Amino acid sequence: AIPAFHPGELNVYSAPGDVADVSRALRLTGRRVMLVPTMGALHEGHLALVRAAKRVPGSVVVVSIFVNPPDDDLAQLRAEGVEIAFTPTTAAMYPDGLRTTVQPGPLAAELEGGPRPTHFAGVLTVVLKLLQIVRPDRVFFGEKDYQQLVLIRQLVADFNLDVAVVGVPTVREADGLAMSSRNRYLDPAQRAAAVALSAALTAAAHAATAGAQAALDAARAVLDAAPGVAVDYLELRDIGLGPMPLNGSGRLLVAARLGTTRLLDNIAIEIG
Amino acid sequence: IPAFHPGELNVYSAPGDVADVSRALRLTGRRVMLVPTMGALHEGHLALVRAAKRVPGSVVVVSIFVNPMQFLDAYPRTPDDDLAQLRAEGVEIAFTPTTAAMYPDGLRTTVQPGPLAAELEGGPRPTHFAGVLTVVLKLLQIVRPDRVFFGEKDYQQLVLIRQLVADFNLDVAVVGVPTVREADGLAMSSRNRYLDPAQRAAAVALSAALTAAAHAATAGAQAALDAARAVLDAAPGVAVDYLELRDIGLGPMPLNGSGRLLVAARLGTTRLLDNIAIEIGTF
């Protein structure tokens, strides 16, 4: 017996086996299964992922909410017309504790894997599990965590997963600051200074007609004009995060500490 | 999707091809059975295949791939002898990928097995099981079978694959098939061919030791282990690596009434393994 599912209602499952059965029942009735993974505390960036997923003709949207080791979140999803919320416990996800895991490739040891070297192993492990539980046709992630998104594409590619990975443009505040759950903690002076990250990147992207060095010098100047912004890295790479080619498409990534808050941002760059 | 000829042996090299045929088949309601092999097929593989064949409306996929990542040049390869037997058994799909198609980016994302992988066969081979679980995951994702078949001979490997499948929520049933033996009890293996006639005669000691322990066990674990050791010790040119009695999941738990006795031994340059279910005291 397939667990109950009521079309056009918010259906909330906590059992991995339950969401798996429903997703399979749906896939067999025609629906295209779309997965939006979240650690909850939903914001406009999640709603953008949901609207992207909702656009696909015949979609049923699954939003997972799992804090990788509420009433409001569900209300937000209902207001978006999401049909499934997957909300498992730690024990349901890890009934045998930590055992088999994903070892990311070398990219995980670079950039954000510098301060957090086992972060991405955790992330790719739980993403792989959610993909196997729900078996979506498409999985939606924001572009803010760029290195993570690239490592997920590598996961998908390396383990031959049959899922399209869709990166959705980062939703930003009125002044460009990338949506983040860390932003609410900035005092007004930190919050005014944080704008330098996206200002630096958008300056870089426009300076890039003048080449790579001008793009980087432009970003760096903008960061140098902000007080209390401790830059951990500022790096131009190819879109896959390998070495930036002579000319061509790239990505510019920055990370910085503002008091106790670590902020990240990144942007598409085109050289010359 | 490529040509599939039913009732015929269809050979596919490209992952995308076998993936599409397999998907096509499952939507027609055929159940997809996978027998992963490293080629050089013997009667143990045929038994894996026959088990897969008896699943109703099954279509059977046998994959043949020598994975560089679990090691290599020495390994037995005989694809002429491999595909002939598959046709003879009525297997309809052989999946024979190239190293390039499987590892176009080299080794990058890999499976890190649990701590079982550092024990027994993994002790002196630290990344061996990481290589095995990665290839098995990739084959499962390419073929997406309903059930996958393994022999019980490489028991530690089978337990690790069960872990892989539970730990990554894979939608596949793992089937262990009792180890096929030569008529003296020697466990089928690709490595047997490397035994000279002296060594082949001596090699009966591993299975003799195991069956001895299994009946010795009414008198307890020490008696079972001591009987096995004596049989191994009485055997010419058998150098024992390990001889270990564990719980059936091999894992972070003692032993109850029931478990698994595992032996690895060297005959000249050839390493032989075997194992058996053991019941201690009552059972």
Ligand SMILES: COc1ccc(S(=O)(=O)NC(=O)c2cc3cc(OC)ccc3n2CC(=O)O)cc1
């Ligand atoms: C063939 O007759 C039909 C087909 C579809 C519908 S419906 O209004 O679009 N509802 C469903 O299709 C539907 C119900 C349903 C229940 C399930 O678990 C109990 C799982 C999937 C279900 N579906 C498919 C869907 O919502 O698209 C109603 C009647």
Ligand SMILES: COc1ccc(S(=O)(=O)NC(=O)c2cc3cc(OC)ccc3n2CC(=O)O)cc1
């Ligand atoms: C393993 O993959 C995930 C997926 C989602 C999360 S999360 O912590 O719930 N969500 C976010 O991190 C998040 C999503 C998002 C989307 C955006 O635009 C579409 C912009 C920013 C986003 N964030 C940033 C944040 O919340 O810190 C975390 C890890």
Ligand SMILES: COc1ccc(S(=O)(=O)NC(=O)c2cc3cc(OC)ccc3n2CC(=O)O)cc1
């Ligand atoms: C990664 O998972 C696998 C799966 C199969 C192989 S293999 O080298 O082609 N085959 C075996 O190792 C094997 C299968 C088998 C079956 C048996 O009876 C059912 C008995 C022994 C078996 N072997 C042992 C062997 O060939 O050494 C190798 C690795």
